[PDB]
Scaffold this active site. Structure first.
Site, short mmCIF file in Angstrom:
data_model
loop_
_atom_site.label_atom_id
_atom_site.label_comp_id
_atom_site.label_asym_id
_atom_site.label_seq_id
_atom_site.Cartn_x
_atom_site.Cartn_y
_atom_site.Cartn_z
N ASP A 92 0.79 -1.21 0.00
CA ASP A 92 0.00 0.00 0.00
C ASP A 92 0.83 1.27 0.00
OD1 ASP A 92 -1.90 1.99 0.71
OD2 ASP A 92 -3.04 0.49 1.84
N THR A 93 0.89 1.93 -1.15
CA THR A 93 1.67 3.15 -1.28
C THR A 93 0.98 4.35 -0.63
OG1 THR A 93 0.69 3.52 -3.45
CG2 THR A 93 2.83 2.38 -3.39
N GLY A 94 -0.30 4.20 -0.31
CA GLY A 94 -1.02 5.29 0.32
C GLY A 94 -0.81 5.34 1.82
O1 NMB Z 1 -8.46 5.25 3.80
S1 NMB Z 1 -7.57 4.17 4.01
O2 NMB Z 1 -7.60 3.48 5.28
N1 NMB Z 1 -7.72 3.13 2.72
C1 NMB Z 1 -9.04 2.90 2.34
C2 NMB Z 1 -9.80 3.15 1.08
C3 NMB Z 1 -10.80 2.27 0.65
C4 NMB Z 1 -11.49 2.52 -0.53
C5 NMB Z 1 -11.18 3.67 -1.31
C6 NMB Z 1 -10.17 4.56 -0.90
C7 NMB Z 1 -9.48 4.30 0.31
C8 NMB Z 1 -6.88 1.99 2.42
C9 NMB Z 1 -6.86 0.98 3.58
O3 NMB Z 1 -8.21 0.45 3.65
C10 NMB Z 1 -8.50 -0.73 3.05
C11 NMB Z 1 -9.50 -1.55 3.56
C12 NMB Z 1 -9.81 -2.77 2.93
C13 NMB Z 1 -9.11 -3.18 1.78
C14 NMB Z 1 -8.10 -2.36 1.26
C15 NMB Z 1 -7.80 -1.14 1.89
C16 NMB Z 1 -5.62 2.69 1.93
O4 NMB Z 1 -5.02 1.99 0.87
C17 NMB Z 1 -4.55 2.95 2.96
O5 NMB Z 1 -3.52 3.63 2.28
C18 NMB Z 1 -5.00 3.77 4.15
C19 NMB Z 1 -3.82 4.47 4.84
O6 NMB Z 1 -3.44 3.74 6.03
C20 NMB Z 1 -2.41 4.18 6.79
C21 NMB Z 1 -1.62 3.28 7.52
C22 NMB Z 1 -0.56 3.73 8.32
C23 NMB Z 1 -0.28 5.10 8.38
C24 NMB Z 1 -1.06 6.03 7.65
C25 NMB Z 1 -2.12 5.56 6.86
N2 NMB Z 1 -6.08 4.73 3.77
C26 NMB Z 1 -5.89 5.86 2.83
C27 NMB Z 1 -5.43 7.19 3.37
C28 NMB Z 1 -4.10 7.61 3.14
C29 NMB Z 1 -3.65 8.86 3.65
C30 NMB Z 1 -4.53 9.69 4.38
C31 NMB Z 1 -5.86 9.27 4.61
C32 NMB Z 1 -6.31 8.02 4.10
#
Ligand code: NMB
EC number: 3.4.23.16
Lengths: 99, 99
Positions: free
Chosen positions: B25-27
């Site tokens: 996860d690059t986000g």
């Molecule tokens: O919102 S998130 O939580 N996101 C969810 C999402 C689902 C559907 C559409 C868009 C987004 C997933 C994770 O959620 C899921 C759930 C189920 C399956 C796959 C992903 C994402 O890829 C991650 O990258 C985390 C960042 O997690 C972190 C971990 C550690 C430290 C910091 C962050 N978030 C996105 C995000 C990033 C930056 C700011 C706010 C929000």
């Protein structure tokens, strides 16, 4: 381009004529952008991740330009703290993870 | 390798001698794994997703193998929806985004 992950992978996108900054998020199935007006009909949807779910409005067939690459796809609009480009659009620009 | 994004970028990781599936996860700035026991002392940390913040336990200097690549870094444990390998470990394994 080749993007390193030392810093957040933020790119400039163009949608609805507006230029925005967005995070390339390989863990995101979908693309979710902060509240904005998009044309067309939309469907409500609930998306969640860390911290829980948020209600968003789903617009289909939206044209976006990511770092100069045009992509068409569903875009979700809602109270997200950051604009996120998910896999539905990253695939269209030919984005891959390499190591 | 080169991982496309047509499907979730799930890889097998080995931590505490067990195999688990995690998302590249690059986000995510950090790496967060589902509830589990890790050695040593932990510090508190708040990480936010799209729906808000969650409190997690931070463990430092944890060995984790990501697709045969050994990394040693900070691992967070808490109520995450999925095991997430974030940028802190992705940089360790030399992962880049390309298009
Ligand atoms: O919102 S998130 O939580 N996101 C969810 C999402 C689902 C559907 C559409 C868009 C987004 C997933 C994770 O959620 C899921 C759930 C189920 C399956 C796959 C992903 C994402 O890829 C991650 O990258 C985390 C960042 O997690 C972190 C971990 C550690 C430290 C910091 C962050 N978030 C996105 C995000 C990033 C930056 C700011 C706010 C929000």
């Amino acid at each position: 381009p080749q993007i390193t992950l030392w810093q957040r992978p933020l790119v400039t996108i163009k949608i609805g004529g507006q230029l925005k900054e967005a995070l390339l998020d390989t863990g995101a199935d979908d693309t979710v952008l902060e509240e904005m007006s998009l044309p067309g009909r939309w469907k409500p949807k609930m998306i969640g991740g860390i911290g829980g779910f948020i209600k968003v409005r789903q617009y289909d067939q939206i044209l976006i330009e990511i770092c100069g690459h045009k992509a068409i796809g569903t875009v979700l609009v809602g109270p997200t703290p950051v604009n996120i480009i998910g896999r539905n659009l990253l695939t269209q620009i030919g984005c891959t993870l390499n190591f």
